[PDB]
Design an enzyme around this catalytic site. Structure first.
Site, PDB file in Angstrom:
ATOM      1  N   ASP A 167      11.450  -2.188 -13.219  1.00 53.55           N
ATOM      2  CA  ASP A 167      10.136  -2.439 -13.324  1.00 53.55           C
ATOM      3  C   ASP A 167       9.214  -0.897 -13.823  1.00 53.55           C
ATOM      4  O   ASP A 167       8.461  -0.529 -12.992  1.00 53.55           O
ATOM      5  CB  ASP A 167       9.607  -2.831 -11.971  1.00 53.55           C
ATOM      6  CG  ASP A 167       8.128  -3.305 -11.978  1.00 53.55           C
ATOM      7  OD1 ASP A 167       7.963  -3.807 -13.120  1.00 53.55           O
ATOM      8  OD2 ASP A 167       7.489  -3.475 -10.835  1.00 53.55           O
ATOM      9  N   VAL A 205       0.744  -1.081   0.010  1.00 51.89           N
ATOM     10  CA  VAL A 205       0.073   0.018  -0.106  1.00 51.89           C
ATOM     11  C   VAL A 205       0.911   1.238   0.108  1.00 51.89           C
ATOM     12  O   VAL A 205       2.007   1.127   0.689  1.00 51.89           O
ATOM     13  CB  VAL A 205      -0.819  -0.084   1.364  1.00 51.89           C
ATOM     14  CG1 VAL A 205       0.086  -0.132   2.637  1.00 51.89           C
ATOM     15  CG2 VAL A 205      -1.696   1.226   1.453  1.00 51.89           C
ATOM     16  N   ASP A 234       0.366  10.722 -10.821  1.00 52.62           N
ATOM     17  CA  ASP A 234       1.339   9.547 -11.571  1.00 52.62           C
ATOM     18  C   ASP A 234       0.877   9.752 -13.091  1.00 52.62           C
ATOM     19  O   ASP A 234      -0.247  10.430 -13.364  1.00 52.62           O
ATOM     20  CB  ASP A 234       1.059   8.308 -10.925  1.00 52.62           C
ATOM     21  CG  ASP A 234      -0.199   7.918 -11.221  1.00 52.62           C
ATOM     22  OD1 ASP A 234      -0.911   8.219 -10.290  1.00 52.62           O
ATOM     23  OD2 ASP A 234      -0.481   7.136 -12.452  1.00 52.62           O
ATOM     24  N   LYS A 250       5.533   4.179   1.499  1.00 50.39           N
ATOM     25  CA  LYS A 250       5.302   2.871   1.201  1.00 50.39           C
ATOM     26  C   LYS A 250       5.680   1.941   2.033  1.00 50.39           C
ATOM     27  O   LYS A 250       6.778   1.804   2.831  1.00 50.39           O
ATOM     28  CB  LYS A 250       6.262   2.714  -0.252  1.00 50.39           C
ATOM     29  CG  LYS A 250       5.694   3.822  -1.384  1.00 50.39           C
ATOM     30  CD  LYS A 250       6.452   3.498  -2.731  1.00 50.39           C
ATOM     31  CE  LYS A 250       6.110   4.776  -3.570  1.00 50.39           C
ATOM     32  NZ  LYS A 250       6.844   4.170  -4.924  1.00 50.39           N
ATOM     33  N   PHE A 262       6.767  13.527  -2.097  1.00 49.02           N
ATOM     34  CA  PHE A 262       5.585  13.362  -2.527  1.00 49.02           C
ATOM     35  C   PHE A 262       5.556  14.254  -3.976  1.00 49.02           C
ATOM     36  O   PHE A 262       5.782  15.231  -3.771  1.00 49.02           O
ATOM     37  CB  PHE A 262       4.582  14.012  -1.551  1.00 49.02           C
ATOM     38  CG  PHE A 262       2.931  13.526  -1.946  1.00 49.02           C
ATOM     39  CD1 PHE A 262       2.396  12.384  -1.719  1.00 49.02           C
ATOM     40  CD2 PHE A 262       2.281  14.645  -2.612  1.00 49.02           C
ATOM     41  CE1 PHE A 262       1.064  12.236  -2.087  1.00 49.02           C
ATOM     42  CE2 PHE A 262       0.628  14.452  -2.882  1.00 49.02           C
ATOM     43  CZ  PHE A 262       0.288  13.372  -2.805  1.00 49.02           C
TER      44      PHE A 262
HETATM   45  N1  NW1 Z   1       1.976  11.588  -4.959  1.00 44.41           N
HETATM   46  C1  NW1 Z   1       2.892  10.478  -4.809  1.00 44.41           C
HETATM   47  N2  NW1 Z   1       4.216  10.575  -4.683  1.00 44.41           N
HETATM   48  C2  NW1 Z   1       5.154   9.536  -4.843  1.00 44.41           C
HETATM   49  N3  NW1 Z   1       6.399   9.584  -4.514  1.00 44.41           N
HETATM   50  C3  NW1 Z   1       4.766   8.334  -5.036  1.00 44.41           C
HETATM   51  N4  NW1 Z   1       5.536   7.076  -5.355  1.00 44.41           N
HETATM   52  O1  NW1 Z   1       6.964   7.209  -5.178  1.00 44.41           O
HETATM   53  C4  NW1 Z   1       3.004   8.181  -5.671  1.00 44.41           C
HETATM   54  O2  NW1 Z   1       2.738   7.008  -5.997  1.00 44.41           O
HETATM   55  C5  NW1 Z   1       1.362   7.080  -6.277  1.00 44.41           C
HETATM   56  C6  NW1 Z   1       1.092   5.787  -7.187  1.00 44.41           C
HETATM   57  C7  NW1 Z   1       1.517   4.530  -6.305  1.00 44.41           C
HETATM   58  C8  NW1 Z   1       1.325   3.143  -7.267  1.00 44.41           C
HETATM   59  C9  NW1 Z   1      -0.265   3.174  -7.577  1.00 44.41           C
HETATM   60  C10 NW1 Z   1      -0.560   4.320  -8.328  1.00 44.41           C
HETATM   61  C11 NW1 Z   1      -0.310   5.601  -7.486  1.00 44.41           C
HETATM   62  N5  NW1 Z   1       2.694   9.284  -5.544  1.00 44.41           N
END
Ligand code: NW1
EC number: 2.7.11.22
Length: 290
Positions: free
Chosen positions: A119, A17, A78, A33, A74
């Site tokens: 990946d 998650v 995405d 994470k 953050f």
């Molecule tokens: N906002 C945000 N910041 C991050 N740094 C980040 N991941 O590193 C992240 O991940 C959002 C993703 C995670 C995988 C499922 C789809 C949504 N969001």
């Protein structure tokens, strides 16, 4: 974990998650994470020093009670969400180009330190309102192994997997990320995944149907890979003009070099940075709805 306040469950990544969280003292907003054998801790910990503007920053590694939480910078959206929002219109070519160019710089940096992503996929490419794009999860697969199924048992995507990996090569290289990025590049351009396999054999055969069934003429040694079978159907390669129609010949030429079968001749991120497609690269800002 008592230093944070989880705002919302952003989604489910490969390892668990992902949460939007707020640091209780500083008030910083972070993505957390939830994911340990000593090896994986040393490796991840080395990824805290791999900083680059086009790499999502790993802020901290929290290990409490056999539970590992990675704290990253953050970002606000995405790339899958952004392409989904850009579906009727498609992402403007100049932004697609800026994004490719930035991701090629992020890959050139990590690959100069011998770190691979392994990946790459639209969900782990993150964008902000200033026009930047950054890679999340860099070096994590080597650190912990990328599972077949996620924490919710979500299917791990094969769509971006390089053919040497699907063919069983055990020592594949930094070229696997270039292959993934070339697939993501194609998808931005056409608004459809390039090779949406739903199993390892379907992934491979979708690849072979578009780029032709590889043989010793285009990929020396491929016939001796562990999972290569002489019984593979033999398909003819398709023109790239049919694969990513929108794209100009410079872009098609770069994509074709990013999708070379032989990993040794596939174009490197640093060499891709000098391709003529980037001669008029700029930095547009996306149109984001947060
Ligand atoms: N906002 C945000 N910041 C991050 N740094 C980040 N991941 O590193 C992240 O991940 C959002 C993703 C995670 C995988 C499922 C789809 C949504 N969001």
């Amino acid at each position: 974990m008592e230093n944070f306040q989880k705002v919302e469950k952003i989604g489910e990544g490969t390892y668990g998650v992902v949460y939007k969280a707020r640091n209780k003292l500083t008030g910083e907003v972070v993505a957390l994470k939830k994911i340990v054998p000593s090896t994986a801790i040393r490796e991840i910990s080395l990824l805290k020093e791999l900083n680059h503007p086009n790499i999502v920053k790993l802020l901290d590694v929290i290990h409490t009670e056999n539970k590992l939480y990675l704290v990253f910078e953050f970002l606000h959206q995405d790339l899958k969400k952004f392409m989904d929002a850009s579906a009727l219109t498609g992402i403007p070519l100049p932004l697609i180009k800026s994004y490719l160019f930035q991701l090629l710089q992020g890959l050139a940096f990590c690959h100069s330190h011998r770190v691979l992503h392994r990946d790459l996929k639209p969900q782990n490419l993150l964008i902000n309102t200033e026009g930047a794009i950054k890679l999340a999860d860099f070096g994590l697969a080597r650190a912990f192994g990328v599972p077949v199924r996620t924490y919710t048992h979500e299917v791990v995507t094969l769509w971006y997997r390089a053919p040497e990996i699907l063919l069983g090569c055990k020592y594949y290289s930094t070229a696997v990320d270039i292959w993934s990025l070339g697939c993501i590049f194609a998808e931005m351009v056409t608004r459809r995944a390039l090779f949406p396999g739903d199993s390892e054999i379907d992934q491979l055969f979708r690849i072979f149907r578009t780029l032709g069934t590889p043989d010793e003429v285009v990929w020396p040694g491929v016939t001796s890979m562990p999972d290569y079978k002489p019984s593979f159907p033999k398909w003819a390669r398709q023109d790239f003009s049919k694969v990513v129609p929108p794209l100009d010949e410079d872009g098609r030429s770069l994509l074709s070099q990013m999708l070379h079968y032989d990993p040794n001749k596939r174009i490197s991120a640093k060499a891709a940075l000098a391709h003529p497609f980037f001669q008029d690269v700029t930095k547009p800002v996306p149109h984001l709805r947060l």
